[PDB]
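The data are passed on as follows:
___
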Amino acid sequence: SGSWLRDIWDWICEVLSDFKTWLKAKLMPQL
């Protein structure tokens, strides 16, 4: 393979931020 720990690193960062917003957007009034 070519880029594995670098190309997947950006995706791992987006999943970490989404895991915090997705779970929050489901409940709570404002955000």
Remarks:
- The radius of gyration is 14 Å.
- The CA atoms of residues 13 and 19 lie 10 Å apart.
- The chain is about 65% helix and 0% strand.
